[PDB]
Amino acid sequence: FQSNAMKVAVLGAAGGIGQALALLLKLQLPAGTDLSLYDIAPVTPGVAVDVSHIPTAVNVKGFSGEDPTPALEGADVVLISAGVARKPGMDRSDLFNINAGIVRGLIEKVAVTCPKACVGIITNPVNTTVAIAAEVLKKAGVYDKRKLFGVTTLDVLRSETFVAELKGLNVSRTSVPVIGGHSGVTILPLLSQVQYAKWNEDEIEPLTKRIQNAGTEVLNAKAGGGSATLSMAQAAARFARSLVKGLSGETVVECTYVEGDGKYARFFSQPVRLGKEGVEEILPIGPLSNFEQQALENMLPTLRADIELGEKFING
Amino acid sequence: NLYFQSNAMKVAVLGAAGGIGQALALLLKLQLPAGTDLSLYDIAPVTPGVAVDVSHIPTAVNVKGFSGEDPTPALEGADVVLISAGVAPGMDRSDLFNINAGIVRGLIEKVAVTCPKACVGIITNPVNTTVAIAAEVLKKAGVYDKRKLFGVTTLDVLRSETFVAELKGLNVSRTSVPVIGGHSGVTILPLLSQVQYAKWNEDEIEPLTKRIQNAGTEVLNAKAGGGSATLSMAQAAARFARSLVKGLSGETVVECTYVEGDGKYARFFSQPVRLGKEGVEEILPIGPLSNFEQQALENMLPTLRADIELGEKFING
């Protein structure tokens, strides 16, 4: 069952993101929480042993091989960070090319073993991989709209970080709502809703563009070889932390990609109140500036098409 | 001069591209106090991008990355220098050493010139030896300060805290276990007899002490030849860096660490050390030992002295 000692499962724990996430979870999760780390690579048991030497009351266990079932049994939260992250040769293309199958394979296991878990899709491209997860869950007859999330949190860290620097605000207490999708023109930070910031029309377009293209700053600084591994892990840990709090009865609100009312797109990221069933209430986006309003209408076709790509991968 | 006194604390990580380094830069971005500057350096060209990666995390810690053959920009004004460069599967201990000993020498040569008054924490293995190496390089430049050179043994401490807490039902985040001696094999000596609230049967001592001493190998084997401990090692380093930053900032802390002390047992030896504004403020005594610990200490010295000798020879002769 669920809801006694909280149980968190990480599928993709051997990758760059996964290992970093495992570390943060060991240090951040509540005492008593069970942490199951899974990946195909035989190194995974060793990753868990490595993390288990850190003195926190989080119980960590390792799993490898073809079947993630032992790691998923009784899972409350399932974080999927398997597959590849962007790199030099990889465009929107290569991520979907490799990660579409991986996601499907893992979600099929989740649908059988722990269908009532809150599922956090970190693996990119999120706009599409979430639709893949949904369709797989629907085929198995266990899809719960309240428990499937596209982890868009890295766009929030980035927006908070760049906004605080530019406007001289407290970097750790500056809330910036971000809506839409988790890629390119689909990422829309709502700068007009940020408190204590007076915006010249001049700085709106460049800041938005910097938030949207932030991954490229890393990709170019890393001289190609590497993506945003460390910030992605922190974004995932922060989201996981919010999920666990919602499940534990503590109200938290996070902007995340979920199947909402479909006003703009079947799946869409917006403020969500998290609770005991995962989503408790999908909140409105609130008032938008002319700029933000236009950016929203302009992303719709791209966002819808990203979703249709994931749907068609499962439904043909 | 009674009022306000600012503080532009700076921490540099040499070897920020490896497994340990990247995890360490993440933890330091998250754990260092607001306003601290974090400099990352490694010959690997990816380093500047590692820094851009962590710079997207919303904390008031400014981070910059540097690559190339010159770590100078990374060391300028540094208060704390953590050296995790070099290599950790499928290699003889003598095969690595020659590679790592050289890299440590090269980096300490720059430290001596650019930031000689910085506290230097050596993570790169074998620590028993690499520390002697750094000490001799600093001495050649006439800047070796005993109070500012440390062998980071903190991981033996985390392991000791964790194994003891779990075996004896104690609070894992509130269990203190002193670890003395060195950072490798028989030289790692956890003082189990000084652990509060733990009743030991004589037969539990040997296997638990061996578990702590052989923890590295257990991770090495468990990773199926995919590497050594990296994640727990980054956290050990983060904790030691956090302690150095506290001491320098005027906050008294005590950490078991490998330093040049009274030389009662060996030139360099790990023991409790009160940290302060000059690095080492006072090197405290090991305290009372059980018969087992006293024997383990005596049986271990020849190996520890030889590890030190090797590091001195690498530089002097």
Curated annotation (Swiss-Prot), chain A:
Please give the annotated consequence of changing residue 198 to E: In strain: 176, 667, a7205, b7017, c1271, c6134, c7424 and c8032
Question: What's any one GO cellular component for it?
Answer: cytoplasm
What does changing residue 69 to I do?
In strain: 432
Any keyword NAD?
yes
According to the record, mutating residue 112 to T results in: In strain: a7205, BR355 and e6181
Residues noted as binding substrate in the record, renumbered to the chain? 86, 92, 124, 158
Q: What HAMAP family does the annotation carry?
A: Malate_dehydrog_1
| UniProt protein name | Malate dehydrogenase
Please report the organism this UniProt entry assigns to the protein. Answer: Haemophilus influenzae (strain ATCC 51907 / DSM 11121 / KW20 / Rd)
